[PDB]
Design a protein around this ligand. Structure first.
Ligand SMILES: NC(=O)C1=CN([C@@H]2O[C@H](COP(=O)(O)OP(=O)(O)OC[C@H]3O[C@@H](n4cnc5c(N)ncnc54)[C@H](OP(=O)(O)O)[C@@H]3O)[C@@H](O)[C@H]2O)C=CC1
Ligand SMILES: [Zn+2]
Lengths: 80, 318, 105, 243, 115, 116
């Protein structure tokens, strides 16, 4: 498996993902050392978190708004 | 010989590189196959024998896709030269009558043996030899006897022998299938005045020969090109006389009395109705149980009558 | 692509190729349609590579060599335009319009 | 030299290869052959110049290209039909069945992103992931994660190189790689006052480096010794590392 | 939108390019700066093959060599959506101001010297 | 100071009136089909003509603007004008009729695999 979530750098609609990703990557790789994380975007996009299971199978959800703590809940839902 | 994706492209001069050589081809069947062959960018060596008759095969393609060589089946060196550079070669050959210089033998047996010997000496991939319907080794039409001998010789040497046996053909300017219907001053023959068999349209013959001449995995198979449905008799004359003139006028003469016209036929300037045709009027399609057809090469040849509506319609009354 | 040949012609009066990428093989040159033909269709270029070796080197004791190529019978200017070339180092004897070689002596 | 003359030429916008900078080229084409290249103008990235290797891909293009699929019988290497080679590949895959953690694809040197997307997606669709690069035993992470894109690439602006106070280069010879980056280095070095040092390979580059060893211990010594003063004291410094 | 007088199926199939023509680097002179160009791509199988008889380059693109010359990029793109095919625009690139004292021929204490 | 089959050019305003006008055009363009088969001696039948005419008008069922439908009406009535007599010839006339399949051989089955 490997996960991938890419972030706008506008202040609106990304500050949940911003202050998530400034904290929780050490939670992710020390939670999933085999699963490979990548975060790769700056410019104006929509906040979507995108997992892929280990046999060619995509999965996604948008990550609209929760100041924190449901961002990780929707991430854990994407693991499930 | 190795190639790229498939046959059917979408534009002329998107040329293939396949270098074909078609024997005969001045007359009837060899029009439409080189018309299908130069349409899609293939180099054609078409040899000939008469200079004034070879001209109307040039406009099928533009440049380098039609070429003229001065073959003659007597000359070894001419056919030797003719397929030095070729990649595939078909021979539609053989008059439906002897000349004043040719037997029925050695117009598709040793005439076939010379060119197939040139094929073996040149290692030409994909040799295709047409041969007649009902090509037996029995006597009664020595035409058919000779075509059976020709198929035997083309299988003696050269296992690269895709033999194709078309039925009686059906197209514009049909030599002895519809010219004896269209002009037809008094079509009079067939002692058995019915009891013929399968017609096949000519552009379907050409499409069959085109779809065989390029694909592989068909070496040494023999084909017979069946009529689509009807295998019908001389009752199609009635459908020919469905056009309003009904001038067909079959007078069903006795057999040995009919020979004299054919024995007249050798003396004439132009060919008429030589007696192996008269003997084939007693035959039918001895249809091979095991020979691959249009359904094998993925075609459906067109039916008789609705195509005959187009094919004979200069010849109406009003 | 197969085995056939007709040994009746080299490249030109010069034996090998005239320049980069000017071949003289006939099979790649589509030997399909050279047949029934004389080979006396025109191989007439004498390959001017050979014709500078025909030409003798001209000497000028100055430093700048004028080249025209124009005749001394024509009423109009017909040679290549007036290029002034240098004869300074030996070797650079090459009027780039004619190939006449100009050496300083 | 004399191959063409510029009105025959479908002058065509394109992007450079053979350098990571993605230089600003424009291809002169005669229609099948490629005649030459011209560096187009692109003011941020390498405004007027080309890497000199990139100027002569034309003689590297039309010389020995693969025009057809080739298969080996074995030390006997014949060309063949496209569909034949495809069915041979699929049949060999069915023969070996490399199901799990196998079929090592590897990122080549000079490809496109879209082919690499097809590569990664086809490998992950086939069942595993093993895609590395050309590097001599880089069958391992590049020791900076694919997370946080800014960590990865040359994340300072190429124009801001001539806005840098003093930089130092480690593990690279920027004359040998990205020569137009070297051109902007020299442009800054003649414009402004820059303290430049190489650490690692012994290089002759035309902007007066001060080489400080060929060893990692020399690197850490030079960092803690005097560039810990310089880079902290300087205003917007840069620190450039080789691949 | 249906095309009124465009008999091809260009409008669904090809990618066209709106671009400012680049400033040539060989000559100085800037007349190509003041246009806008429409160009159909060669992303094709047709894509100018090689002839075998004489050896020209017979193409298969019926609209290989064609250039509009427009005035404004938005007028260009309003035409491009009006006749209606898939485009891609490409932004030009200027040359940036740099102050050029011709007197740049003076130094303090410094190693390197020039012409 | 003349016509040939009364070609008129005057585009109305309302889309209902243009609807009725194209409808009557469709009637004449459909009625002339045995006259077409007489005039050009095609192989196919008169119902082939009729289903292809219906195909051609269903090509532009969902065109919005009446100010596009005007010149579509002009093109339709004008090609009716050039078909109702012998201006067009049968070589010119078969450019509407992709009739036969056997010209193509085996070809693209609209799969990606057989683009290669
Ligand atoms: N009833 C039928 O006709 C049927 C035809 N076939 C087969 O189809 C093949 C082609 O049919 P078709 O198109 O009508 O053939 P053609 O009527 O077109 O004649 C074949 C061409 O080859 C020439 N040719 C080749 N070798 C010789 C030779 N030794 N002597 C004289 N002429 C020669 C012929 O005359 P020239 O030299 O002047 O060019 C002629 O131009 C036939 O050979 C036949 O075996 C099979 C089923 C029915
Ligand atoms: Zn000169």
């Amino acid at each position: 498996r490997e996960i991938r979530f890419h972030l706008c750098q506008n202040g609106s609609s990304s500050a949940p993902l911003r202050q998530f990703v400034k904290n929780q990557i050490g939670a992710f790789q020390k939670a999933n050392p085999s699963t490979k994380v990548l975060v790769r975007e700056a410019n104006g996009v929509k906040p979507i978190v995108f997992a892929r299971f280990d046999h060619g199978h995509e999965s996604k959800i948008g990550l609209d708004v929760s100041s924190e703590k449901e961002v990780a809940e929707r991430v854990k839902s994407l693991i499930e | 010989g190795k190639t790229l994706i498939a046959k059917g492209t979408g534009g002329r001069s998107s040329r293939t590189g396949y270098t074909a050589t078609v024997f005969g081809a001045n007359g009837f069947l060899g029009s439409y196959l080189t018309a299908k062959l130069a349409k899609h960018g293939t180099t054609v060596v078409v040899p000939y024998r008469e200079e004034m008759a070879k001209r109307h095969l040039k406009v099928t393609g533009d440049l380098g896709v039609v070429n003229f060589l001065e073959m003659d089946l007597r000359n070894l060196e001419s056919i030797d030269e003719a397929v030095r550079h070729s990649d595939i070669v078909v021979n539609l050959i053989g008059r439906e009558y002897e000349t004043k210089n040719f037997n029925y033998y050695d117009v598709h047996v040793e005439g076939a043996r010379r060119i197939a010997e040139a094929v073996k000496k040149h290692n030409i991939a994909r040799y295709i030899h047409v041969s007649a319907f009902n090509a037996e080794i029995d006597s009664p039409s020595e035409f058919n006897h000779t075509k059976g001998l020709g198929e035997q010789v083309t299988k003696d040497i050269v296992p690269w022998a895709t033999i194709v046996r078309p039925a009686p053909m059906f197209g514009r300017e049909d030599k002895w299938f519809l010219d004896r219907m269209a002009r037809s001053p008094c079509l009079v023959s067939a002692n058995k005045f019915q009891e013929t068999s399968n017609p096949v349209h000519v552009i379907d013959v050409a499409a069959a020969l085109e779809r065989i001449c390029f694909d592989d995995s068909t070496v040494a198979q023999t084909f017979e090109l069946y009529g689509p449905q009807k295998f019908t008799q001389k009752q199609i004359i009635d459908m020919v006389s469905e056009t309003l003139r009904k001038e067909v006028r079959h007078i069903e003469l006795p057999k040995a009395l009919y020979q004299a016209y054919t024995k007249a036929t050798q003396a004439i300037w132009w060919p008429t109705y030589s007696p192996d045709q008269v003997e084939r009027q007693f035959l039918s399609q001895k249809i091979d149980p095991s020979a691959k057809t249009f359904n094998d090469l993925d075609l459906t040849p067109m039916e008789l009558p609705d195509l005959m509506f187009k094919l004979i319609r200069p010849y109406r009354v009003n | 692509i197969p085995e056939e040949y007709t040994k009746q012609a080299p490249n030109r009066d010069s034996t090998w190729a005239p320049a980069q990428a000017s071949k003289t093989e006939i099979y790649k040159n589509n030997m399909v349609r050279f047949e029934q033909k004389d080979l006396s269709k025109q191989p007439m270029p004498y390959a001017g590579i050979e014709l500078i070796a025909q030409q003798p080197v001209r000497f000028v004791h100055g430093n700048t060599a004028v080249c025209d190529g124009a005749n001394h019978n024509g009423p109009g200017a017909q040679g290549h335009p007036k290029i002034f070339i240098n004869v300074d180092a030996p070797g650079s004897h090459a009027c780039q319009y004619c190939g006449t070689r100009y050496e300083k002596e | 030299a004399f191959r063409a003359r510029p009105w025959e030429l479908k002058k065509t916008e394109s992007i450079d290869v053979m350098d990571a900078v993605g230089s600003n080229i424009r291809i002169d084409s005669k229609g099948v052959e490629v005649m030459r290249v011209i560096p187009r103008v692109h003011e941020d990235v390498n405004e007027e110049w080309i890497n000199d290797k990139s100027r002569f891909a034309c003689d590297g293009l039309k010389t020995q290209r693969l025009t057809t699929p080739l298969i080996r019988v074995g030390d006997k290497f014949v060309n063949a039909t496209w569909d034949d080679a495809l069915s041979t590949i699929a049949k060999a895959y069915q023969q070996k069945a490399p199901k799990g953690d196998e079929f090592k694809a590897v990122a080549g040197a000079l490809v496109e992103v879209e082919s690499m997307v097809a590569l990664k997606d086809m490998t992950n669709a086939l069942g595993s992931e093993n895609t590395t690069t050309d590097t001599p035993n880089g069958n391992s992470a590049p020791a900076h994660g694919i997370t946080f894109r800014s960590n990865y690439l040359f994340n300072s602006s190429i124009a801001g190189i001539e806005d840098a106070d003093a930089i130092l280069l480690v593990g690279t010879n920027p004359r040998r790689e990205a020569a137009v980056m070297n051109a902007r280095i020299r442009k800054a070095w003649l414009r402004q006052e820059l303290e430049i040092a190489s650490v690692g390979p012994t290089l002759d580059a035309t902007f007066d480096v001060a080489e400080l060893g060929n060893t990692h211990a020399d690197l850490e010594k030079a960092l803690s010794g005097e560039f810990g003063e310089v880079l902290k004291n300087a205003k917007n410094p840069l620190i450039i590392v080789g691949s | 939108e249906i095309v009124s007088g465009a008999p091809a199926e260009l409008s669904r199939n090809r990618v066209v390019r709106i671009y400012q023509q680049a400033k040539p680097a060989t000559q100085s002179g800037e007349y190509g700066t003041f246009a806008w160009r429409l160009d159909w791509d060669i992303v094709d199988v047709a894509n100018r093959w090689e002839n075998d008889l004489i050896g020209w380059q017979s193409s298969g693109d019926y609209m290989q060599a064609t250039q509009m010359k427009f005035t404004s990029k938005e007028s260009a793109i309003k035409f491009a959506n009006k006749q209606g095919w898939d485009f891609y625009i490409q932004e030009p690139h200027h040359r940036k101001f740099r102050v050029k004292q011709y007197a740049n021929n003076f130094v303090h204490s410094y190693g390197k010297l020039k012409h | 100071i003349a016509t040939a089959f009364a070609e008129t050019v005057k585009f109305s305003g309302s889309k209902q009136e243009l609807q009725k006008r194209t409808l009557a055009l469709y009637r004449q363009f459909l009625r002339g089909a045995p006259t077409f088969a007489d005039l050009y001696e095609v192989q196919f039948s008169i119902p082939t003509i009729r289903t292809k005419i219906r195909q051609e008008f269903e090509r532009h069922r969902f065109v919005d603007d009446l100010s596009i439908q005007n010149v579509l009406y002009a093109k339709g009535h004008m090609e009716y004008q050039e078909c109702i007599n012998f201006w067009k010839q049968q070589a010119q006339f078969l450019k509407y009729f992709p009739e036969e399949d056997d010209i193509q051989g085996r070809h693209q089955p609209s799969n990606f695999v057989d683009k290669f």
